Each structure stands twice: as structure tokens, then as C-alpha cells.
Amino acid sequence: RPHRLIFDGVKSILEAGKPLDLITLSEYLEQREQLEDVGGFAYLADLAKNTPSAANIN
Amino acid sequence: KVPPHSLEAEQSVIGGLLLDNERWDTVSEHVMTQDFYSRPHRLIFDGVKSILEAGKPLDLITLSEYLEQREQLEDVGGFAYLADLAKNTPSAANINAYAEIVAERALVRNLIGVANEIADAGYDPQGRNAEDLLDLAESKVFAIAEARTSENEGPKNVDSILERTLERIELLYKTPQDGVTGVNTGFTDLNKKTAGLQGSDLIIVAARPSMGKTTFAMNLCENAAMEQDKPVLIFSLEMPAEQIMMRMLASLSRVDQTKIRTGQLDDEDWARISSTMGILMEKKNMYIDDSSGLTPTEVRSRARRIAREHGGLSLIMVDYLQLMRVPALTDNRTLEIAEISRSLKALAKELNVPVVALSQLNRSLEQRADKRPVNSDLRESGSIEQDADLIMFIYRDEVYHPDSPLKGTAEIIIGKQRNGPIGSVRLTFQGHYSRFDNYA
Amino acid sequence: KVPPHSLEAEQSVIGGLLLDNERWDTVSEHVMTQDFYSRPHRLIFDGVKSILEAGKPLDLITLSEYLEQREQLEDVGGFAYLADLAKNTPSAANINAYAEIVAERALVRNLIGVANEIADAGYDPQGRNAEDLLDLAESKVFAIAEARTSENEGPKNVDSILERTLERIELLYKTPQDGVTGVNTGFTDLNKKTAGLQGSDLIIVAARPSMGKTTFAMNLCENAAMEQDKPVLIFSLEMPAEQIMMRMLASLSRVDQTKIRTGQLDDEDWARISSTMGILMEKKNMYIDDSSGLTPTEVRSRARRIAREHGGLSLIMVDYLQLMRVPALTDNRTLEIAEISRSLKALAKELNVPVVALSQLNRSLEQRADKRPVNSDLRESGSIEQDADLIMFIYRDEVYHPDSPLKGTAEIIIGKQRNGPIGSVRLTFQGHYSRFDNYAGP
Amino acid sequence: KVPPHSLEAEQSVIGGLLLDNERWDTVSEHVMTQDFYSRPHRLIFDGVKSILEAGKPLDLITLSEYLEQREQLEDVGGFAYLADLAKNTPSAANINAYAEIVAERALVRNLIGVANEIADAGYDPQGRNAEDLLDLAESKVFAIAEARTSENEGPKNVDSILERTLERIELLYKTPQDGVTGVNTGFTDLNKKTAGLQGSDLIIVAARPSMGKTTFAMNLCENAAMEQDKPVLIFSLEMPAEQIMMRMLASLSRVDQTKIRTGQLDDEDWARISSTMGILMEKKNMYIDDSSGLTPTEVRSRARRIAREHGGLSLIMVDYLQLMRVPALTDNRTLEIAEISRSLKALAKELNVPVVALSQLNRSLEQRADKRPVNSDLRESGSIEQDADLIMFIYRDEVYHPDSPLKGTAEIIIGKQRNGPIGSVRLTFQGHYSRFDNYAG
Amino acid sequence: DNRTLEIAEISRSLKALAKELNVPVVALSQLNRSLEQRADKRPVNSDLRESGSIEQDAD
DNA sequence: TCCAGATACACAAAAAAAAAAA
Numbered sequence A: 001r002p003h004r005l006i007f008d009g010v011k012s013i014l015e016a017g018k019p020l021d022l023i024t025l026s027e028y029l030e031q032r033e034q035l036e037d038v039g040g041f042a043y044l045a046d047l048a049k050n051t052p053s054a055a056n057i058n
Numbered sequence B: 001k002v003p004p005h006s007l008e009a010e011q012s013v014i015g016g017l018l019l020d021n022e023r024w025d026t027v028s029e030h031v032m033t034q035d036f037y038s039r040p041h042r043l044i045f046d047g048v049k050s051i052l053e054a055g056k057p058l059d060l061i062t063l064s065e066y067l068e069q070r071e072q073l074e075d076v077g078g079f080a081y082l083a084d085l086a087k088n089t090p091s092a093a094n095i096n097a098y099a100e101i102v103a104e105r106a107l108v109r110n111l112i113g114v115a116n117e118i119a120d121a122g123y124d125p126q127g128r129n130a131e132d133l134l135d136l137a138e139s140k141v142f143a144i145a146e147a148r149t150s151e152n153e154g155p156k157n158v159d160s161i162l163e164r165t166l167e168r169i170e171l172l173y174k175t176p177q178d179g180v181t182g183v184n185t186g187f188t189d190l191n192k193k194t195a196g197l198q199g200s201d202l203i204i205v206a207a208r209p210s211m212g213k214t215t216f217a218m219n220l221c222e223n224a225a226m227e228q229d230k231p232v233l234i235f236s237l238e239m240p241a242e243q244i245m246m247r248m249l250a251s252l253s254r255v256d257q258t259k260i261r262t263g264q265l266d267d268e269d270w271a272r273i274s275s276t277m278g279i280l281m282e283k284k285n286m287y288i289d290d291s292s293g294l295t296p297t298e299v300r301s302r303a304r305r306i307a308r309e310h311g312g313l314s315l316i317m318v319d320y321l322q323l324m325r326v327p328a329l330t331d332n333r334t335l336e337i338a339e340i341s342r343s344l345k346a347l348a349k350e351l352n353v354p355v356v357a358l359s360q361l362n363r364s365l366e367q368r369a370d371k372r373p374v375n376s377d378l379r380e381s382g383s384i385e386q387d388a389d390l391i392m393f394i395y396r397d398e399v400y401h402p403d404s405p406l407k408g409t410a411e412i413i414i415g416k417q418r419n420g421p422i423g424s425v426r427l428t429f430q431g432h433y434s435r436f437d438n439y440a
Numbered sequence C: 001k002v003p004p005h006s007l008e009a010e011q012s013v014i015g016g017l018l019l020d021n022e023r024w025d026t027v028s029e030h031v032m033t034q035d036f037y038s039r040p041h042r043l044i045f046d047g048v049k050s051i052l053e054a055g056k057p058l059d060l061i062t063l064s065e066y067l068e069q070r071e072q073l074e075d076v077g078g079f080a081y082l083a084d085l086a087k088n089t090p091s092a093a094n095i096n097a098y099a100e101i102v103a104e105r106a107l108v109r110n111l112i113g114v115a116n117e118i119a120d121a122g123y124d125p126q127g128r129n130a131e132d133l134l135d136l137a138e139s140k141v142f143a144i145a146e147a148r149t150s151e152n153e154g155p156k157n158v159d160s161i162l163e164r165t166l167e168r169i170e171l172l173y174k175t176p177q178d179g180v181t182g183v184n185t186g187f188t189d190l191n192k193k194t195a196g197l198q199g200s201d202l203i204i205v206a207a208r209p210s211m212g213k214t215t216f217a218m219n220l221c222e223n224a225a226m227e228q229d230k231p232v233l234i235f236s237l238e239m240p241a242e243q244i245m246m247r248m249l250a251s252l253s254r255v256d257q258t259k260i261r262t263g264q265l266d267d268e269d270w271a272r273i274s275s276t277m278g279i280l281m282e283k284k285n286m287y288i289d290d291s292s293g294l295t296p297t298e299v300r301s302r303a304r305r306i307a308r309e310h311g312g313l314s315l316i317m318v319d320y321l322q323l324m325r326v327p328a329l330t331d332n333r334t335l336e337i338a339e340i341s342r343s344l345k346a347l348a349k350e351l352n353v354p355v356v357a358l359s360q361l362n363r364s365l366e367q368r369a370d371k372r373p374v375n376s377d378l379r380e381s382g383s384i385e386q387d388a389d390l391i392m393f394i395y396r397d398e399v400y401h402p403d404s405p406l407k408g409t410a411e412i413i414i415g416k417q418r419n420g421p422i423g424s425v426r427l428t429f430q431g432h433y434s435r436f437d438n439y440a441g442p
Numbered sequence D: 001k002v003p004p005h006s007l008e009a010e011q012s013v014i015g016g017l018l019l020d021n022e023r024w025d026t027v028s029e030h031v032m033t034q035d036f037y038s039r040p041h042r043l044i045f046d047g048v049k050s051i052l053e054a055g056k057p058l059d060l061i062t063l064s065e066y067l068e069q070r071e072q073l074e075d076v077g078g079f080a081y082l083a084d085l086a087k088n089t090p091s092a093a094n095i096n097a098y099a100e101i102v103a104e105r106a107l108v109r110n111l112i113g114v115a116n117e118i119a120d121a122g123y124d125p126q127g128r129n130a131e132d133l134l135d136l137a138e139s140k141v142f143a144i145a146e147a148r149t150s151e152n153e154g155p156k157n158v159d160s161i162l163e164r165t166l167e168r169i170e171l172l173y174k175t176p177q178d179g180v181t182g183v184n185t186g187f188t189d190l191n192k193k194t195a196g197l198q199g200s201d202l203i204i205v206a207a208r209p210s211m212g213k214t215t216f217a218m219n220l221c222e223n224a225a226m227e228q229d230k231p232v233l234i235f236s237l238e239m240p241a242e243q244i245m246m247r248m249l250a251s252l253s254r255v256d257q258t259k260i261r262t263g264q265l266d267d268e269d270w271a272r273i274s275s276t277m278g279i280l281m282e283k284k285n286m287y288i289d290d291s292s293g294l295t296p297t298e299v300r301s302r303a304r305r306i307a308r309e310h311g312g313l314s315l316i317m318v319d320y321l322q323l324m325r326v327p328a329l330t331d332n333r334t335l336e337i338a339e340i341s342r343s344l345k346a347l348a349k350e351l352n353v354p355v356v357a358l359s360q361l362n363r364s365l366e367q368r369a370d371k372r373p374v375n376s377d378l379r380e381s382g383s384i385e386q387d388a389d390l391i392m393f394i395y396r397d398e399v400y401h402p403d404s405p406l407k408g409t410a411e412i413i414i415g416k417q418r419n420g421p422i423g424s425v426r427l428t429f430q431g432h433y434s435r436f437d438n439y440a441g
Numbered sequence E: 001d002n003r004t005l006e007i008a009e010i011s012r013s014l015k016a017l018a019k020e021l022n023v024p025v026v027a028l029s030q031l032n033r034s035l036e037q038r039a040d041k042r043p044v045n046s047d048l049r050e051s052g053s054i055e056q057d058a059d
Numbered sequence F: 001t002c003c004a005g006a007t008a009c010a011c012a013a014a015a016a017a018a019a020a021a022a
Ligand SMILES: Nc1ncnc2c1ncn2[C@@H]1O[C@H](COP(=O)(O)OP(=O)(O)OP(O)(O)=S)[C@@H](O)[C@H]1O
Pocket: B208, B209, B210, B211, B212, B213, B214, B215, B216, B257, B258, B431, B432, B434, C416, C417, C418, C419, C420, C421, C422
């Protein structure tokens, strides 16, 4: 479920063309009291750090 | 924290209503059942209203009888409290002051509640941005003071009608009147019927697609701008501004619109365009807004800003009222239409400027043998019909029947008018210039 | 309760200002000195703004020196805090979003403050009556809303718009492009009225069964493919691609459709078919989708895939819009049609290409003395007509009146056009070739 | 479980009986001896009834004497209780309400008793079948209705109707009125063949366009307003109040309509207009409404408000019924017109005032050889002619035949009268003044 | 609860079966009674019963 | 919220009649 919520946030951010980063996604999740469910900013930072590259993202 | 309330006023008004009943009509227009703070007083007022509206005489005995019919005497405090209210009241000569003060206290409490609501609505936005919150706050604050509109729409006596008739006869006797009082429309018969676009009125122009709504509204706005001194504000919610300027140049210079759009021009057309541009830049009394999906609050704010900057307005045009969005009523359309119409009427009353709000008609109109519109064909016809002051329709028979002998002629139908006669006016339509002119 | 704010946004703004200096112009127009929440953050932003306005270059060393000049370096956490802020910057590309977030938080905090201020009054009237309380609400809300201004979504004087229109009409004097500005339909009379098929528009062709709707749409698409460069996409939800290909061969090669279908051809017909085969195989500018029951999302995805692959599109055809399915609203038909029409219009606006969507007509047309279609004959068509930029009907008089003098001719009725004239156009109809043509004769 | 009762109501009843004796006839027809609940209250009510039926005055002294006679002073709480009974009565103006409350309490108590008896009998059949139990329940529940003795609506016997009709006839006979028993219409022949505009009737005045329909209606309204006392109400769905006022001024002041419209007058015309204005302002018994497309409920509410303000009406006029709109039945015109006519008739019956509604005629009149209108010529008008009580048509021979020797004379043909003879009358027409008048010679 | 949608579904299913099996399908249909009110008794395509899809889907 | 089937009143009116014009 936290992955479902973070993917919903990513889809909402990227569907409008606005830039997506840690700050934007974190502030979008916090606006609806959903940042506590996903694990806070620490989990988002770990997810961002743990990805080396998007060579085979597809 | 003690919210604003006054038990003394409620006790006094209840005692007065119990004592005397001939004053019920005077008081019933000032207070409401939900205005009372405490629950027992609300129940008492509900029972009093139920008894009095039924026509039965109202006293202590029948009130206590009524309260027993629904097992409510114990909650109020029994017959003893009602007897104390009946006895302890000294008199009822100053009941209206108590009604006014209790209404004021209820209004203050409601304003406090709305302030708390807006304050709490900003801690958990739930995906809403600052603009939406500000619009909601403005709507909530404005809806509180807007409710004080009632007591109208009643038959007139003989004295008022006789005075109005005498004034009309005297004005006819006087020559320097020109037959118009407000904004001249530029058309002969329309000025004879409507006596110009009177101030503080809401005008609804409704027609089927491809009939000449925008053309008519633009012609009226151009005439108002040319004649008046205060500017004219146009809210274009469907068209770009450059297209509006091209239409205006074509209408004022009598140059084919297609020639301007494509770029094939001769010397005479260029001279006419130069003269029209010179005149327009000499006047400089028009403002065009091209935003999409404007809320009523934004329209009001922009209109007020323009009026303060320039010191007044002459005419406001909306194209059209079906595109305005009310954020709080996105799940209901009839309520949204009613809110839009009420907001436009309130703006027209506040700025003392007529508002031309275009509309569209239902598709069931084309099923009938006669294609001419009526007042019942409006989309969400209820609120718009109730709140309007002058409803005009545009009909062109050449659109439906190509072989009709009425080529180059449009019919204007005055479906409603509060202070004037209804009828019909025929006008000459010149499509290539996007212009309505008089009919010989 | 904690006031709404984002310290991370302020840190990102400061880091982006420190690392990048070319984007100061955009940042300077969205944030102010009093927008920041943290006092050391406010001091740091004030110092950075002063340095940037002074014209001196911005760097960590000069910022530390300037803070030491005012003895505020130790107050804001020291040089180590500034170094950490510089190091923790994600990137300088999205500083505008951070500034917007900071501005939004400041706005909502000030709105909450104003709400608390008005709420405090009423619990202590201090002589004011209800009218005074009502009056000192609108003023406060207008003051808190006037700081933000629409840009550039504001009323404009006639001078600027007139000058822009004059500039537009001055450059349009040259290169008339023979009138047509969009996609050439191939028919002169319809080109005069429609001025071609303009992009970012929705065009609807509707008629009664067996009138020449698919033939007309296919002729338009074929002409566009022959003339234009980008591919033309066709969604055939009604017929297989084989029948459409046979119809196109019959139309282009001037060969009877029935003989093609039944395989009874002479040598000249084969020569014509070979010539049109060579032309079509040389062009390679056509795409056909014969899938059934496509959802709007699938149509959008396939159109985007083709457009990205070839760099753009020329025209999109749907046959027809009533055969599309929206599974979320299978219990209501009007809302489904509304969603389909809105999705088609949105796709047309997004791809900036015209979309020719076909539609059917209600049976009430033939229960009247006059059989000419109107705008109310379209089925479940509040949205179909509300968000349509052009509606063209097809009417053949020989179908209803066998003895009509208009035999071998068809009329195209333009029932709606936002920025163009309306009327009728007469075209020659040759059914055995599945082709429309210009009216050479009277 | 406390049985339904209210000792305060019965106490107020007996207190009002003791305090005032001039409304005994207004209360003796509601309550009964056994309808009370409290035993001392029943005893004192029986004593009061016995005193009143004997014709003796009722007061504290007589009540105390009667109680001493029956030695029930201790059984009624004492003389102090008697004083308290007549002390806690606010007013006697609402004694009937207290009496009907007591009667309702008695009725509901009896209904509860009957239901409890049926429930008890159900568990103990005593050798009876289900059909017998159902019949017993039907008889018990029907007895309560039979013993009601006071029910709104419903069938009535012939005796009460005959008595009321005889009283009405005697009242009409005792008042000489020279053959007019309604609202004076202003014309001698019309009054003779109509006896005025009777109440609770729907009157239709219809004619071809440009025949003197609105002129005739306004002439009737002006005559009624000048003669009667209670105000007249007019609903103008076509012309504003200004045109109607101008026509009325021209008619009453004998001034040309064209001169008034063009603003050209003279000293005599100005003096006559001033006199007419003074008289009209002295009377002030008229109302004009110009709202278009009125639904029946709106006109009903407005008429009710005006009648409540002025304590009654004299005449309601609509011009015309074919412009009113019913939103719920816009798909069929015939049903809409039927509903309009039914609503007008219901309003006329409720307010007990005549209603006059104008209507048009079909074009089929021209095709026929005779131009004289008939009942069937009215437009989509099944209920118009199936619900009206008097139908009058205005016919002008000069319009169709310029050579007719009856120029300037409009003939009124009474096409229908439910309770009177049918026929026609002849009246002269004055176009230059827009006023109908009696015919002579 | 809706006859028109039922007839539309029946016609669509018949067309889908004909397309799937690659076989001609003959679907006999009735005619409305509006034909009897005309001086010309020759049937038209619009006289089929509950037949939007019947006339919009047949070949 | 649209689509389709069916009973009944009303609009003339439409042509036809047809009288009569020729
Ligand atoms: N460029 C043009 N050239 C010629 N005729 C035109 C042109 N633009 C509009 N017209 C005609 O003028 C009429 C005026 O209609 P408009 O008021 O401009 O459009 P509309 O009434 O707003 O239609 P909508 O917006 O779809 S409700 C159109 O219906 C056309 O017949």
C-alpha cells in the first residue's frame, strides 16, 4: 500500500508535466496526511539513494 | 469562551407572542426558528409557528397541549416554565427591538462559526492549494451577508400605478428626453421597447448555437464604449482576444472578416482599418479578459479593481455563464447555476452596472414544429428565469430553412421584462461584417 | 497546532541560489524577505539577496564573510551549517517549484492568522455591532488575497491587444497560402468555408445509415495522406482493414468496387490497380487500426506511440465514437458518451492534430415532413455538440425522394463552426467508386 | 400507562363555563357529560349543566348552593378549589378549542378502550371462529365512527341542506335588490339576463382578436370598483399597468385614447382627468399585477394575501388564461389548459368571489358561412367550456361587413349559462373613447 | 429493465458471432406499426422494432 | 437521460371538393 500511494503521487506529479524530485513528492504526500503511512521522508530518501541508474527501467 | 447569546430576549419574545397574536406578521419576517440558541426555545418557536400558521388561536393551554402531542413538555421544563414565561413578561410593546437584537446575535454567532470553519480548513488542506482556500473563504464570508434579500414581487395599489402613469405622461410631454435613459443600444426599435440597457439589471441573451449571441453582445459593448465615458469590461471565457479585436475591426470598418483573417486587402480596406484604429486608440475605454473557468469571486475582484482604478463602469459582458465554475458545488449543476445567477445579480446591484450574461438553450427546442424559443427552454431555467430582469432571444430562420424568404434578417424576442412590454424586433444581419443593423 | 511550513523547501531555495546564479531572475519574482519562517533562514536569505542585488558574485566564502561582517555568522549556525545546506542541495533545476511551495505556505499561514484575528473579534465586541464585524471581514480577506496577482490572467487595455492584432495582420499580408491554413480537404467549396481542417479541433461527421459517412471520412483521410507528410491514423472499429483497402483502391483507381470484391476485372482495371498500388507503396503514409471496443486510454496510448515514433501526425479518424467503451460507467450511457467526447477533445488538443469522429443520428429525423438533419438528432449528444468545433451532416435527397432533380448529388450541412461560416455544399456522389467529387456542373 | 387526557384542558373548560355564560350555546354542542375524565370534574360539569339548563344564573354562590344541596362540597375540593377553577382561566375567547381538545381526548381514550377489548377477546375465543372475530372487530371499530356525531366533509342528509337553502331564500326575499343578487355589471340587459356576476363561478369572455375583449373586461372592472366596497384584483399577463391605467383614465374621464397617448390635451380634459384621479385616490380599491407566465399557485397566493390584507375581495380577473404556464405539464397543451381552468374554478370557489378569465377563438370561424361564434370555437378548450358557468362572446358585425346597418354596435351572445336562460343583448361601441354603453332605439 | 439496450446487445452478439465463426447470419426481425398510418405501405429501414443497432449494425 | 411503443385531444389545414368560373 505505501508503494501504491507513492506511485499515485508520482503519477499525479508527472501527469501535469511539473518537475518531480524528493521535495515535490514529499510536500505532495504531506499535504494529505499520507507521509506517515509511507514511512516519512527517510524512506523516500532511501528509495532515491538505492537506485544506481535507470538503464533497464522498462 | 461564551458565544454571543441572550436568553432574556428569547424569554421576552416568547412571552409577548403568547400574550398577543395580532403582531405575529410583523415579527415573522425578522426571526427564524434556527436563530434561537437554546434547544427548548427552538422547540417552543417551532410549536408557536405550527399553531399560528394553522389559524387556530394561540394561548398557553393550546401550546402546552401541542407540546404534549410529541412528548416534548419534559424537555422544555414542563407547564411551569411556560406559565412563568407567560406571567413574568411585563409587556410586549418593544418586541421588535428584541427580535432585532436576537437576529444580530445569531448573525454574529454564525460569523464566528464561519471564521472557525475557515481557520480549521487551512490546517488539513487535503490536496487543495492556496487559491482554492482563498476562494472558499471569500465565498463563505460573502454568503453570510448576501442572504438579506426578501420581501418583494407583490401586486401594486392604485396610487403607485397612477403616479407612474402621470410621470410617464409628463415625460412624454417634455421633449428633451430622447426616449432613452440608460445605455443606448444603437438600434431604433430596441430603444423604443427596452428604453436602453437600464442600470442595476441582469440581461440574459439566449440562443441556439450559431445564431449571433456573441455578435449581438459585441455590438452592444462597442456602442456603449463609443457613447459612454466610463469603460466597458468584457469577460471572454471561450474566445481568444485577438479574434475579438478582429471582429471589432470588421464590424466598425465595414470590412469583410475573411479578408482580415486571411490577409487579402485593398487600399480602401486599409484606410478604413487605419481610421477605425485611430478612433479606438482615441477612446481607450474597453477592457477584455480572456481567462478560462473564472469563479464568481475572481470576476467580482477584477471588476471592483477596474472600477476603483478608473472610477466607474458602464457595461459588463459575460460569454458565457455556463462556463463559470463554483468549486464548492462541482457535484451539482442546478445549484451552481443558481449561485452564478445570484452572484451576477449581486454584482450588478453593487456596481450599478448592467450585466449581459449569455446562455444556451436545451436541445428539445428543435423537436417542436416552431423553432422560436420560449422562457421555458432555458437550461436550468428556474433560477435564471426567476433572477433575470430582461430576457432576449435571437432567432434566424435562414439557419434552419435555407429557402426561407427572410434572408438577411434576424428576430429579437423579448421573453421577459419587469418594467416594460414584451414583443419582437426584426434586425438586419450582415454576416461577413459580423454586424447587426436596423431593418428598413 | 503546527503552522504549515516547509523548512526543507527554504533550504533547497537557499542551496539553489548559492549553486546557480543564472536563475535568480525567476526566483526574485516569487519570494520575498518575510516569506521565510525560520529566523536564521530569514537572515541568510536577506544577506544573500543583498549580496545578489549589490552585483557582487555569490559564493560560500563571500557569504560567510558578509555574515561575519554583521556578526550574524554564529547566529545562523556557523559556516558548517552553510556548508551542509550547500551540500544537501538536490539540484538547481527545480528552484521555481521550491519558491512556489514557500509562497503557498506563507499564504496559507497568513490566511490562518487572518481567520484567527477575525474569530477573536466577536468574543469581545468592544462596542462594534454586527455590521462592523461583517465589514471587517471582507477588508481583511481582500488584503490577504490582493498580494497574489494573476499573471498574465488579468484584464487588458485595448492598446496592447490592438497592437498585437495589428502586428498579426501585418505579417499575414505576405504568403496567403491560397486561403487554406490547415489540412486541405480536396474539395474547393468546403475548403472555402472550413479553411481546411484546423488542428487542435474536433470534427464530427454524422448522418443516417447508408448516407456516405465512412466514404466521406475516408476520402478526407486519403487526400490528407496523399498531400501531407506526417502519417494519418485511422481507427476502424466497424469494418476490417481489408474492406477499407478495397474501397480506397476502388476510389483512387476509378475501378468499380463490386468488380473488385467479386474478382471480375479486365486488363485496364488491373493496370489502374497496379498504378495506385505503386503510388501507395511509394508513399507509406497510412495506418489502420481494426481493433474492436477500444477504450479512450488505449486510443490515446496508441496515438502517442505513433506520434513519437514518426515525430507527428496529420489526422485522426474514429469510426465511430459510440462504439468506444468506458468500463467504469457501464450502467450509464449518457455519462459514458460524455467521457468519450471529452477524451477525444482532450486528445485532439494534446496532439495538436484534427480528429474526425463519426456519429449516428436519432430516429426522429424520419418522423417529420422535412428530413434535413439538425443538431438535436445526434444520439445522447449534450456533450457531443457542447465540445465539438465543427459538425458536418450528409443529406442525399434521392434516398427519400426517388424523383428529385438532385440525383447523383449530395449536400454537406455545416451545422456549427466557432470561427467560420455555416451553410451547405453540393458534391457529386459516385457510389460505385465510393467517392465524392467537386460539382463541375450546375 | 397514563390514559390520554389533560386535566388542565377540562379545568379550563369548567372555568370558562363558570366565568362566562354568554357562550354556552357555542360550547354545548361539542362536549358531553361523560366526555370528561376526572370524577370530581365530571360531577361539577354535571352540576353546571343542570344549573344552565334550568335557566338560573351561574356564579360561585349558585355553585356552592348546588353543592350543598347534593353535599358534594368535600367531593369537589372545597370552595377554594372552586375559586381556583375560575381563577386560572386566561380568557374565554378560546373555549371552543378547549372543548374540542377534550372531545378529541375522549375519542382517543374510547378508541384505546375498544382496541384493548378486541385484544382481550382475541385470546379468549369462547367457541367463536375467525370470521366471527373479524365481524366483531368491524362492528366495534364502526361503532366509534357512528358515534362521532361530528365529521368534516362526507355525505349529508337532506334536512340540513333544505334548511340552509330555505334560510338563503328567505334572506334573499327579505332584501329588495331589484333583481340583482351578485356584483353589478353596469349594463341593464346583462343584469336582467344574468342577475349580476354570481360568486363561485368562472366567467369566460372571448372574441376574435381586436373585437373589444379587454375593453369589455376593463369596463366591468371599473364599474365593479366604483360600485363595490372590497378591492378588485386584476392579473394582466399582456399589458403593463401603465397601458391599463391610461385606458381606464381615458374611459372614466371621457378623453380620447390617441390624445392621451400623444400627450396632447386641453383644459377640459385636464380638469376631468384631475377629478377622476381624485375620485380614484379616494376609493383605492383596485390592484393590478403584470408578472408574465404566472403559475396557478402564485396567483392563488397573491389573491389570498390581498384578501387577507383587505378582509375579502369582490372580483378576480385574468387576461388571459392562455398565457399561464404549468411547468409539470409542458408536454401537452390540452392538459395544461384543463389544469389552468380547474385552478381558476377552485380559486373562485375558495374565495367566494366571481372570476373572469379571457380566452381566444379558433380561426375555423372564418371558414364557415356564419361568423357568429359558438362554444366549440374556443382554443384547446375542453375544460374551458366544461368548467365555466357563464360564457359570453363579443360579436361586431361592422368588422366583417362594412355595409352592415349596425355600425358601432357590439352584440354580446351568451353562449352558456348553467343556471339561467341563454340569449343575446345589443350594446353600442365607442372606439374614440373605448367604452361600452347601453343601446337605445 | 431496458428493452432497447437488450435488443442492442442481442444484435451486437449476433454480429460478433458472425464475425468470429466466419459464417453468414440471418436475423429475422419484425416491423413497427407506424407503417400502417401511411398511404404508402412499403417498409423503410426505420420501421424495425427497437432498432437503433438493428439498422446501424446490419450489412 | 435518452430511446422506443401506444392512446387520445387538439391544431388547422391540407388537399379535395366544389361551386362555379369560364
Ligand atoms: N468569419 C465569419 N464569416 C462569415 N460568417 C461568420 C463568421 N463568423 C461567424 N459567422 C456567422 O455569424 C453568426 C454569428 O454567430 P456567433 O455569435 O459569432 O457564434 P455563436 O452564436 O457564439 O455560436 P456558439 O458560440 O457556438 S453558441 C454565425 O452563426 C455564422 O453564421
